Symmetry: C9
Subunit: 132 residues, 9 copies
Amino acid sequence: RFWEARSSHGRNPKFESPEALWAACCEYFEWVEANPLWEMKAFSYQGEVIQEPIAKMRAMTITGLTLFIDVTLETWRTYRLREDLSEVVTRAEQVIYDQKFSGAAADLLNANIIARDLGLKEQSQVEDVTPD
Amino acid sequence: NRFWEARSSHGRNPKFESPEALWAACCEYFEWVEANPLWEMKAFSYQGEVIQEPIAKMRAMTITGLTLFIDVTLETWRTYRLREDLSEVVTRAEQVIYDQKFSGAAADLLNANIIARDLGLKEQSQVEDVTPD
Amino acid sequence: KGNRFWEARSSHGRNPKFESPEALWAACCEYFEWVEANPLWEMKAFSYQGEVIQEPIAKMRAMTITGLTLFIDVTLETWRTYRLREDLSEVVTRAEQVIYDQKFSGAAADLLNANIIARDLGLKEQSQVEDVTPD
Amino acid sequence: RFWEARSSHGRNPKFESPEALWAACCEYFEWVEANPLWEMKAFSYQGEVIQEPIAKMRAMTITGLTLFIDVTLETWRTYRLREDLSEVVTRAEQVIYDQKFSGAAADLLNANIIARDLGLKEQSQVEDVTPD
Amino acid sequence: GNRFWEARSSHGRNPKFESPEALWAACCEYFEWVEANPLWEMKAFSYQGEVIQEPIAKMRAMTITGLTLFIDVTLETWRTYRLREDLSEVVTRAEQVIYDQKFSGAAADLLNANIIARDLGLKEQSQVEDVTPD
Amino acid sequence: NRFWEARSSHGRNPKFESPEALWAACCEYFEWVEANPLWEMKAFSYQGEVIQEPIAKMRAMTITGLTLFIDVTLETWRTYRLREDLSEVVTRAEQVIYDQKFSGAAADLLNANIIARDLGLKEQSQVEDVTPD
Amino acid sequence: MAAPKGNRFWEARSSHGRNPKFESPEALWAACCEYFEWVEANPLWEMKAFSYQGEVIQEPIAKMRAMTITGLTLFIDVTLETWRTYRLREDLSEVVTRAEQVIYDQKFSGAAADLLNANIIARDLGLKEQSQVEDVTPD
Amino acid sequence: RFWEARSSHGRNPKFESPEALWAACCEYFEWVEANPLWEMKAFSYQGEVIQEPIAKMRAMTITGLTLFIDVTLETWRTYRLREDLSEVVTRAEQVIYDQKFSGAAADLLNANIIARDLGLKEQSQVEDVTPD
Amino acid sequence: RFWEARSSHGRNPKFESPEALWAACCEYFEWVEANPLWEMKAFSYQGEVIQEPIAKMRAMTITGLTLFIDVTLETWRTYRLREDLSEVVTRAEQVIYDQKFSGAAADLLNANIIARDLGLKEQSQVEDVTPD
C-alpha cells in the first residue's frame, strides 16, 4: 500500500527549514529503498508448488515523494520560491533522476519507460542519397 | 476475474459530499486492486503428472476502473473538479493511478509499451538532415 | 475443450427487445461471464523419463463489442440505437468501459498480446521531433 | 493434407438454404479446430532423442473455407447476392475474423501477421518541436 | 537426384498440360513433396559426457517458383495457364493453397513471420496525426 | 574450412562455352554448399566437466560464392547473361540460389532480416494523415 | 566482502567533507578519483531467487553503476554552477575535462560490454544513428 | 594480439606479382580462421564454478587484411591502377564479403552490424492513403 | 582503476617520432586486452550462493587511448595533421575500429552501441506508391 505511506512529519506539514524538508525527502528515499515492488515467482519441488515474492526496484517519482511527505505538487512547486528551500528541491529532484537513470542503466528498471520519463532523446542524422 | 461486479462500500450511485469520504472510496478501489491480481496459469511436471498453479500478475489501475468501482460515471468524476476540496482528492487519486502503472511498468510487472502509451509518455528525438542542399 | 464460440448465445434468446437498463446490463453481464468461463487453450509439452506428456493451459479470451452484440443477439445498428435513449446509452458506456478495461488490464499483465491490444484499443504512440539541421 | 480436406456437401455444392450453407461453414470451423498445425520439438533422455509433435493453432481464412466447401472465391462472393444466404456469409466471415483476433490476442497466433491480415492499424501523434 | 533443385513430378520432362485434372494432380504432387521434405535444424544433447545430435524438422515454405520448378514448366508457361479457364481455376486454386500454407505456417510461428509477411505482401497500416500547435 | 579454396572440377579460369558445362559446374557448387555446413562451437557440461562440440549450421548460397567456386569473376558471370547459349543457365542458377535462401530464412535456419535484404523482399505500408482541418 | 554494503547514494560524500573549496588541480582530481572508486565499490544489486528442497533463497547480484557528471558533483559536494566555474582556470579546466572523459568512457565501455543498458547509455552519450535514404519512386 | 599479426611477406612489402599478392591475402584468410575470438562461459555444479572459453567467428575486414599484409589502405587502393592487381583486390574483397554474409546468415556473426557493414539495404513501398 | 592507467611515456608527453607514438599506442592496446570488464554471475547449491566474475571484452576507444597516453584530444588531432605522425594515427585508429567491429560481430560487444560508435549507417530505398 504505497498510497498509505507518509513521512514522520505528519499531515499537511509546513516546512520552514531546509534541514527539515531535506530530511523528509530522505525519509522518502529510504522508504522507496525499503519497499520494493514484488514479482510473484513460482517454484516446485517434487509435486508441490511454492510461490515466493521476488524484489523489483521501485522507481522514484516526484508525485511519489510529494504524496509521501503529504503535500501537493503545487505546494512542492511553491518550495521552488525561496532559495533556502529551492536548493533542497533541486537536490531531491536530482536524486530522483539519478536513481531512475542508474536503475535503468543497470537493467533493474525498464529502459524505455525510464528513457521516456527522463526525457532522454534519440539523436539521428539522415542523408538523402537520391541521385539528381 | 469478475471485476465488473466489484463495488465500494459506498454502494450504488453514491453522492460524495466530503473529501475524506471520496478519498476513502478511492482507497477502497486501490485496496481492491492490490487484493485482486490477474492470474496466469502456469504448468509444472513431476514424476509423470502435470500440476497447474495460478500465478499472480499485477492489475493496472485505471480511472475508468476507479469510477466503475465507486459507481460514478466519468461525467460525475469530472464534476468533482468544480469544487476545491473534491478536486484535490481527484488529483491525488489520479496521481496514485499514474504512479502505480509507472512503477509497475518500470519494474516490468506490467507491459512497458502499453503502459507508456496509456500514460502519454512521449518519445523525444532530434533529427539532423545532412543533405540540406 | 472445443472452441465453438460461434454457437454461444445468451439465455435472453433470439432478437431480444431490451426496454430496460437493468435488462440490458443483465445481458451484458452474461457475456462477460461466458468469456471468463471459456478461456482459450494452449498445449504444453513436458518430458519425463523417455515419455512426453501434453497438458492444455488456459489463455485469456479477449472481450469485444462485436462478441457482446453477437452473444446477446443484437445488431451493431441496434447497439448504437441504445444511444438514442440516454437511459440505455449509460449501460452501453458502462459495458464498453468493462470491455476496454478487460483487454487493457490483460495486455498490461502480458496475459494478452500487448501490441494487438494497443491497436485494438487505439492507444497511440506520441512523439516530439526537433529538426536540428544547422543554418 | 489441408488441400485435401472437404466438407460433407460434396463437389461443386449448391446451397439451397442458409442452414445448409452455415452447416458447411461450421464443418470448416470444426475441421480447423480439429487440425492444428504441428511444431516438432525434441527432448532427450539417457542418450535417445524423442520427437514430440506439439499442437499450434491454425488460423482460419476465407480462402481456406472456400477450398474446404469446394467453391471458388467468386462463387462465395455470389452468396452475398442471395437474400437467403447473405447473412450467413457475413456471419462466417465474422467468425473467421474473430478466431484470428482472439488467437493473436491470446499469443496463440503470431501477433504481427494477424494484425496485418486483420487490418489493425497503428495510430500515432507527432509534434514538431523545432524552435522558430 | 533428390536435392530441391532436382526434385520433379511424375509427369517428367517439360509436360505440356492440357487438362485441369492433370495439372491439379501435378500441383498436389508438389504439395505432398513439400510436406515430405521439411528442412532440418541440428540440435545437440549431452549425456554422461558424450554429445548426441539429431535434427528437428522445419516447415518448407511453398512457392510458385518451387511448384513450377517441380512440375517442370517455366513461369512463362504457368502464366499461360491463366488464359484458358479450365486451367485458370486450377492455377488460382493452387496459388491460394501456396498462400494459405505460408500464412498459416507463419501465424503458427512455424515459418518466420516477417519473411512471410513480406512474401505475401501483407501491409502495415497506420494513421498519423500532426499535433504541432498553430 | 578455407571456403575460398573450394573449386569445381572444371579447373582454373575455365572458359565455359556450353550450357550443360556451366550448369554442371553450378550444380557442383550447389552440392558443395549443401554438403559443407558452417560449424558453431557449443559447450556442454556433466557433473562439473565441460565438453565442446561443433554443431552444423546452414550455409547460404550466393552468386559471389558460386563464381568463386567455379572460378570465374563476378563480371564474367554477368557477361554470361548476354550470351545466347549461357543466359538460361545463369537465370536458372540464380533462381536456385534465391530459393535456397528463401526456404532457409522462412524455416528460421538463416537470419531473416539479412536474407530479406539480400533477396530484396520489400516492406509495404499504407499511411493515412489524420490531421484535422 | 561480497554482499551489499548498503551505502545510500544520496548520502555518499568524499573525504573532503561539506562544501569543499578546491584550489588545486591535485585536490580536485583526488576528489574526482574518490567518486570513481565509490562507484566501483558500490554496485547496484539485483535480487535473484534460487531454491533447494522447497526453500526459497534470496541473493543479491552486483550490477554496474553508471557514472554521471551530476553524480560526481553531488559526491564531492559542489554545485553544477561551481563545476562550470572551474573552466575559468586552465588549471582546473584540465581536471574537469579529464574527469568528464573518464565518465564518458566508463559508460561507453560498460554499455559495449552489455553491463549497462545499451540504449539508455547511447542516449546519454549522444551517440547518433546515421542513415542514408534513396527515393526510388519512378520519376 | 591481432595488431601484431603479420604475413610472411614481412614489413611494408612490395607486391609486383598478382600471385604474390593473392598468396598474402590467403595468409590473412587462414589467420582469421585460426584465430577466433573467445567468449568466457561459466558452468556450475555442486558448489564449484568452472569457466570455459568458447570460439566465436572472427569477421574478416579489408582494414584487417591490409594491417596483416602490412600495407596502408592507400597502397591497397593503388593496386586498382593495374588490371593485374585489381583483379586480385576484387577477389579478396569478394571473399571478405562472403565470409561475413555467410556467417551473419547463419547467426554466427551479428546480423545487423554485418548488414550495415555489407551495405545491404532495406527496400520499402509506402502508400499515402489520405483521402482527398 | 582505469582512470589511473598511464603509459610508460609519462605525463603530458611530447612525441617526436612515429616509433615512439606507435609504441605508446601499443601499450594501450595491450592494457585493454589485459583489463577486461567483469560481470558477476551467480549460482546456487544447497541453499548457498556462489558468485563468479566473468570477463567481458573491453572496447578500445580513441578517448581511452588519449587518457592512457595522457594527451588531449586536440593534441591527438594535431598528430593527424603532422606529416611524420599521420600514418601512425591512421594505423592506431584502424586497430581500434577493427577491435570494436570484430567484437560486435562476434556478439562480444553490444552491436548497436558499437554500430553507432563506428558510424555504420542504415541504408534504405523507398518508393512512394501513392495513387493519382
